[PDB]
């Protein structure tokens, strides 16, 4: 609880929907309002899980 | 560009028309003059069941309306 005050003075995270992935560890995501983005995946996740 | 936005409200209307709980006391009353140019998805068992018309008066009801106003 004492540590907690700094951790919520920290930026949030977006949520989007994967249309479909393509080669070289990238996907294609419309977020909520805006266009579609070709972005990077994490190192903890896999391409096959998408 | 428009009737998409119009009909998706009707879908939003019908979705939250169906699933209250059949226990929460919410009464919904709607009224028009023209009961003809309607979607029969409103005219389903579960959403809108009671259908009440307000017709023109007759000789007895003309006497009753004349009595109250005068």
């Amino acid at each position: 609880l004492r540590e907690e005050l700094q951790l919520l003075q920290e930026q949030g995270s977006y949520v989007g929907e994967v249309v479909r992935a393509m080669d070289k560890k990238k996907v294609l995501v419309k977020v909520h309002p805006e266009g579609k983005f070709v972005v990077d995946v994490d190192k903890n996740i896999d391409i096959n899980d998408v | 560009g428009a009737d998409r936005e119009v009909q998706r409200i009707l879908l939003e209307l019908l979705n939250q028309m169906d699933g209250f709980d059949q226990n929460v006391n919410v009464k919904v009353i709607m009224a028009t003059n023209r009961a003809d140019t309607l979607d029969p998805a409103l005219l389903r068992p579960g959403r809108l069941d009671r259908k009440i018309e307000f017709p023109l008066p007759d000789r007895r009801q003309k006497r009753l309306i004349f009595s109250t106003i005068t």
Partner: protein, 50 residues
């Protein structure tokens, strides 16, 4: 003595764009999975499209 399947599917599914390309797919998976089955339909496409 066949597995009856009633599909109402009137217009609330006609609006659904992103899953509109799969609602027939897994439904026909469901027909060939459960039993000798019989799928029933109605006016719903003719009100939607001709």
């Amino acid at each position: 003595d066949c597995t009856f399947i009633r599909v109402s599917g009137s217009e609330l599914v006609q609006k659904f764009i992103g899953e509109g390309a799969r609602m027939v797919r897994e439904l026909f998976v469901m027909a060939r999975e459960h039993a000798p089955s019989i799928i029933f339909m109605d006016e719903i496409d003719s009100i939607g499209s001709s």
